[PDB]
Design an enzyme around this catalytic site. Sequence first.
Site: not given
Lengths: 342, 342
Positions: B129, B255
């Site tokens: 990710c 993120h």
Amino acid sequence: GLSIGIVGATGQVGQVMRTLLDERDFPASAVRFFASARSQGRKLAFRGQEIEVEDAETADPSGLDIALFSAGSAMSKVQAPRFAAAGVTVIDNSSAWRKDPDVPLVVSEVNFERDAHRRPKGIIANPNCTTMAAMPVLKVLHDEARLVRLVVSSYQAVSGSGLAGVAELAEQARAVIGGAEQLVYDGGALEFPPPNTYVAPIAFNVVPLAGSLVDDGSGETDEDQKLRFESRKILGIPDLLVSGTCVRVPVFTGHSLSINAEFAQPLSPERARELLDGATGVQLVDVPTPLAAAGVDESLVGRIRRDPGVPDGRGLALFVSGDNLRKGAALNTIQIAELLTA
Amino acid sequence: GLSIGIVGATGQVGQVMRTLLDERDFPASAVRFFASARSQGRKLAFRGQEIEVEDAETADPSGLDIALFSAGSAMSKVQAPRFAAAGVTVIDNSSAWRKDPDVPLVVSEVNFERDAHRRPKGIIANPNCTTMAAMPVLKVLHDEARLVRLVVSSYQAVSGSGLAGVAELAEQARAVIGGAEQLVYDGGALEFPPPNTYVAPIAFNVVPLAGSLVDDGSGETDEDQKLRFESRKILGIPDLLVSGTCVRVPVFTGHSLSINAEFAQPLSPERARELLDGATGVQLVDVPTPLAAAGVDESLVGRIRRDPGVPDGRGLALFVSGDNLRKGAALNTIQIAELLTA
């Protein structure tokens, strides 16, 4: 023997200055406090007595040997020369004098001996807190291998913005914590108290923007640029290459830096650990964190690795955490005051 | 026309896969769900009906055209070949197949056409990710100027660790919020529920440690190294120089990456903005944040500046935020499934 003053005694940094003067048994026979009108008149307890909070603008500085300023740059621009005129050595925690070639910009265990004695304006400038956290670490590595380039990404605590940042993080966290898990699927699910200090919510967020955008076409903020200008002046490397990104995080106190540092000769992680383990103002740890740093004096350093993007083992990646109110501000000014009166 | 399965349908990624299949009107005439024993038997609502949660290990894969796996690498190592044997094209959100030279590691708008068609094992691997968030941005810049070196520091949300990370952040924040301001002066002032998932408290902290330390003497974690290996494979740059530091932050989803990227020819911030403003899966913004990214599909990119540590304007510093459950996991597998059946 010594007479000490604290200008801006009621702010967070002033509070820490007061705590540390007491805890470090600073040999001051007189201690004076100053703030601005409407804060003045009040008394503040200090070691067994109550000290009047004087008016920084209009009080008479005469008699003070050293004044620690943490009252903003505007106040400093005017008052530091007034105090220095009265014979006071001024140690200023603000950006006011940092770029002045006749003002040493000093990290106590780094460049005191080299720069502090030459102060024709009677002023020593205290460095930016973010830069300061890195300096006891980088000085040791620089002395060994010669530092030539830095990349820096920071994780900056809100107390960096004074009480206002603390309050903004606390009020936001309190308002949204009840529905917090909803943020897992939708960052806009909850009602945040409107941001004021920061450009976006800070609780449960990260905000890659600290400071004002410099009017030089760069896209950098003044905080981004401090990492360049101040590292250069402190370490005595006028042409140091520096790229920094200052990012605010939901932490109360404790600034952290992910640093990729390149040197002029190979420097291994093992050797960097050997050097930093000894070092003044440094503690080697596996995983530095701002919670561990907050309330202590040393820069915590670890996660030291080779950066393979630099040829021949001349590059490292390392992580630093440090208390931005202590070493990052109050403590360093006191350590300078200690060295001045040793 | 299509028959789709979701293996690991009850985890966070599985949930997002389900939401997106519905929201993106994925033209599946049959949808099947799988988990492990003791999760199976249960039914889960999907678009107007209830779907049995089958046993991934023992159910018969025959009939499925595509299976989206998000069930960990252990399950994948065994079950992906079993499904592929039954004629199923497997898109795996795990690390199991990422290093296999016969498995394409695909970001949908980056290297689908180049790599996806060559899949002799019937498996396509979904990227890490953290890496994934950077790929739609870096591909565009790479195509223009040729990417040669990355420095990366991440700000990683806790949903990256599944429900366990979410719960650990929430429980800690709830336990300490009452006395939160004390952390301004003493990081050890409060009683945190003992950490379990992370090596230190995560609420009101940052933790520069994600993953297991690789047994190669480097000091890097497996997550640190994913940024190197996976960027290389995805972008098709086998010798790309990469130094990454993965840091956990108290954010639920989203993120972020502070990226210093060096190219083989000069690339200005203005030109980078021009290219990214157009780009597929990218949104240009002044100040990317994970709260803005969480719940949306595009990588948010901004704070683009020259990195003066790279000669001749060949280096940039830029900041990216992206939803780690959506583009970072579920969405990309669905976009690959869409391209496979276009």
